[PDB]
Amino acid sequence: SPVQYLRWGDPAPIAAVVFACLGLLATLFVTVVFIIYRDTPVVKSSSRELCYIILAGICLGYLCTFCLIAKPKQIYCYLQRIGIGLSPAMSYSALVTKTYRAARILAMSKKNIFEMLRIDEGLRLKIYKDTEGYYTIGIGHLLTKSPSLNAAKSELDKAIGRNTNGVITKDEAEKLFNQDVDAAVRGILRNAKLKPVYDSLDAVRRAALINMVFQMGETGVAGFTNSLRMLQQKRWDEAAVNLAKSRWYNQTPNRAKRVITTFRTGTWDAYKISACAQLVIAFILICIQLGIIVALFIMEPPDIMVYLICNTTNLGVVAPLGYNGLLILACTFYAFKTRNVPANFNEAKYIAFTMYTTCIIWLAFVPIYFGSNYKIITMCFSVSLSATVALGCMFVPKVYIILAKPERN
Numbered sequence: 244s245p246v247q248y249l250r251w252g253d254p255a256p257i258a259a260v261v262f263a264c265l266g267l268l269a270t271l272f273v274t275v276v277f278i279i280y281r282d283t284p285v286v287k288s289s290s291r292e293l294c295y296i297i298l299a300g301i302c303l304g305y306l307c308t309f310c311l312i313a314k315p316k317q318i319y320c321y322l323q324r325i326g327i328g329l330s331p332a333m334s335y336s337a338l339v340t341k342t343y344r345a346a347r348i349l350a351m352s353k354k355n356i357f358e359m360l361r362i363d364e365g366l367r368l369k370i371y372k373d374t375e376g377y378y379t380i381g382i383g384h385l386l387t388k389s390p391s392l393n394a395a396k397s398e399l400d401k402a403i404g405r406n407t408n409g410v411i412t413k414d415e416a417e418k419l420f421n422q423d424v425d426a427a428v429r430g431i432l433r434n435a436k437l438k439p440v441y442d443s444l445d446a447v448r449r450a451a452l453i454n455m456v457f458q459m460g461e462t463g464v465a466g467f468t469n470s471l472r473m474l475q476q477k478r479w480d481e482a483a484v485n486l487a488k489s490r491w492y493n494q495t496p497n498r499a500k501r502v503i504t505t506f507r508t509g510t511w512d513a514y515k516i517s518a519c520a521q522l523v524i525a526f527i528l529i530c531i532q533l534g535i536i537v538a539l540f541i542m543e544p545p546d547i548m549v550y551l552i553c554n555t556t557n558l559g560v561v562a563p564l565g566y567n568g569l570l571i572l573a574c575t576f577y578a579f580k581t582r583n584v585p586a587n588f589n590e591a592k593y594i595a596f597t598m599y600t601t602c603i604i605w606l607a608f609v610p611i612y613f614g615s616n617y618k619i620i621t622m623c624f625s626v627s628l629s630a631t632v633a634l635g636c637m638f639v640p641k642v643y644i645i646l647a648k649p650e651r652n
C-alpha cells in the first residue's frame with residue numbers, strides 16, 4: 244500500500260500513483276474529446292488513426308507506474324519491460340510517420356516553385372557569372388565572391404557533397420534553390436509592406452509572389468502597393484487587371500502573364516508543372532521494438548529480485564532505450580524541418596517544441612537513471628513527464644481550440 248509508505252515517511256510511491264492517475268484522466272479526457280468532435284476541421288485535417296496510437300502510447304506510459312509500483316508478481320516484471328519499451332515506441336513511431344509525411348508534402352511544395360522559376364527565369368547546370376560578375380550556378384545561386392574560379396568549385400563541392408567539377412544536375416540545382424527560396428522568405432517576412440500579403444495568400448499564390456521578388460526585388464514588389472492590397476483582400480480578378488497595366492507587364496509580358504494568371508486561379512495552370520500506408524509503417528516500427536523486447540525476454544528471463552524490484556540488467560534497458568532514441572531523433576529531424584508549416588492551425592510548431600523538450604528529457608535520463616540509487620521512482624517520474632509533455636504540447640492546444648474557441652475552427 245502506497246499510503247503506508249507515505250505514513251512511514253516516504254512520499255515517492257504515493258506521488259507517482261497520483262501523477263499517473265491525473266495523467267490517465269487527462270488522456271481519457273482528450274481522447275473522448277477527439278471522439279465526439281471527430282468531424283471538426285481541427286481533428287479531421289490531421290490523422291485520426293495515428294492519434295489513437297499516440298494517445299494509446301501515452302496511456303500505457305502512465306500505466307507503467309502501476310508495474311513499477313505493484314504487488315510482487317512475476318508477470319509484472321514482464322509488464323514493466325514491455326511497457327517502458329513499447330509505450331514510447333507507439334507514440335514516437337506513429338509521430339515520425341506524421342512528421343515524415345508533413346516533410347514529404349513540404350518537399351513537394353518546394354518542388355513546384357522550383358519548376359516555376361526554371362521556366363520563368365532559367366537554369367544553368369555549369370558555373371557562370373551574373374551581371375555583377377560574381378560566380379554563379381543554377382537559378383542565380385551565388386557560390387562565392389572571389390575572382391578565383393577555383394573558389395566557386397570548392398564552395399560548390401562543399402555545397403553538393405561530391406566532386407562536381409563545376410557541373411551539377413537538376414536535382415542538385417534544386418537543392419541550392421531551396422536555400423535561396425528560404426532566404427527570400429526571410430526577407431519578405433522582414434519587409435513590412437510584403438509581410439501581411441504573404442501571410443494571407445495560400446500555398447500556390449505565395450510562389451507567385453516570390454517569383455516577382457526574384458525578378459524585381461523586395462523593394463520593387465513593394466511598388467505594387469495597390470495591387471498587393473487587392474491580393475490580400477482576396478480580390479484576384481481586380482489584382483490581375485491592375486497588374487496588367489504595370490510597366491512590369493509591358494516590359495516582360497510572356498513571364499508576367501503567367502505569374503498574374505497564378506494569382507487569379509491560385510493554381511499551376513499557367514505552367515506545365517497515403518493514410519493506410521502510414522498505418523502499416525507505424526505498425527512495423529512498433530514491431531521492431533517488440534522484437535527487441537521479446538528477444539531480451541529470451542536472452543535475459545525477467546525475475547523478481549510496494550516497490551517491485553526486477554532483475555532487469557542494463558542491456559535489458561539500454562537496447563530498447565537506444566531504439567526509441569532513433570525514433571525521437573528521426574521525429575525531431577523532420578519536425579524541425581517542418582517547424583514553420585502553418586497547416587492545421589500551426590500544428591507543426593507544437594510538434595517541434597515537444598520533440599525539443601523530449602530530446603532534452605531523454606538525454607538527461609541516461610546519466611540520472613544509471614547513476615541513481617532510486618531508479619524505480621526516477622523511472623516513474625521520467626516516464627510520466629515524457630508522456631505528459633507529449634500530451635500537454637500537442638493535444639491540449641487542439642483540445643483548447645475545440646472547446647473554448649468554436650468559431651475559429
Ligand SMILES: N#Cc1cc(Cl)c(F)c(-c2cc(-n3cccn3)ncn2)c1
Nearest residue numbers: 300301304327330564608625626629630
Ligand atoms: N528506458 C527508458 C525510458 C526513458 C524515458 Cl525518459 C521515458 F520517458 C520512458 C517512457 C516513456 C513513455 N512514454 C509514453 C508516451 C510518451 N512517453 N512511456 C514509458 N516509458 C522510458
Ligand SMILES: CCCCCCCC/C=C\CCCCCCCC(=O)O
Nearest residue numbers: 557561564565568571602605606613
Ligand atoms: C535526443 C536523443 C534521443 C534520446 C537519447 C537516447 C538514449 C539512449 C542511447 C544511448 C544511451 C547510452 C548507453 C547507456 C549508458 C550505459 C550506462 C551504464 O550502464 O553504466
